[PDB]
């Protein structure tokens, strides 16, 4: 499950709503730990 918001909500350009800023709980080198990771996705790669 990925938690997303708009990358640049203050935008009227054609890119408004095209890039989303999402957070993950990722695995890491050790099995006992998780990473909180922020990354950008294009709208077409995610589904609500």
């Amino acid at each position, epitope marked *: 499950t990925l938690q997303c918001t708009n990358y640049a*909500p*203050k935008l009227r*350009s054609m890119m408004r709503g095209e890039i989303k800023n999402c957070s993950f709980n990722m695995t890491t080198e050790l099995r006992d730990k998780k990473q909180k990771v922020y990354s950008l996705f294009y709208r077409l790669d995610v589904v609500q």
Partner: antibody
Amino acid sequence: VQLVQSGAEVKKPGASVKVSCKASGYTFTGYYMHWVRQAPGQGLEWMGWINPNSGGTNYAQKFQGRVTMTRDTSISTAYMELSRLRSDDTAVYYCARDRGREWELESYYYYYYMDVWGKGTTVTVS
Amino acid sequence: ELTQPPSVSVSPGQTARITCSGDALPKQYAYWYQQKPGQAPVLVIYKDSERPSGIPERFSGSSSGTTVTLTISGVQAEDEADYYCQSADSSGTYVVFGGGTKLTVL
């Protein structure tokens, strides 16, 4: 560039004044003309704007129906007519021009900025 | 819809931190203006943080959440002014301003 406004007027309540704003140094059309009020001791109150090309307007709810905005492109001039004046309306009335369209390709966006300002027209009601 | 402090103060050379806040801000840009007695206000910062060339390096902005900030580093006596935040309502159809914050240099 320059925005040239009409001079000061002093009126009694129920009266009206006209605040002109003439463009010089840039094309009159293609930008919106905004009006901002500043009563003595107060901050900046947006009143509304007029599209110098189409004649269309956008008013703050406080002025819609009290203030008439017009224009005449043949003289590159915007106007704001203030009617039904009250003593509450003593203020300096400023005209301003925003930035042009921000084209990405075939788009507009209309982000709003002022910066091109007239010096303001003083309107006193009493 | 925009609220900012009535005043701030710095000694000359100190940083001013002038804030403005409101509900529509997370989705709308703020613009900041410097007004002195006798003149129409002049923009200092646009699109929250950008400085439009003719404005010196002492000025910059930033934003987060519902709060937008104007910071002036190295504030000098010539920077005593009423600073205003400008934005728009949530619809983007009406332009709004804060009441203005007086920055005095002591």
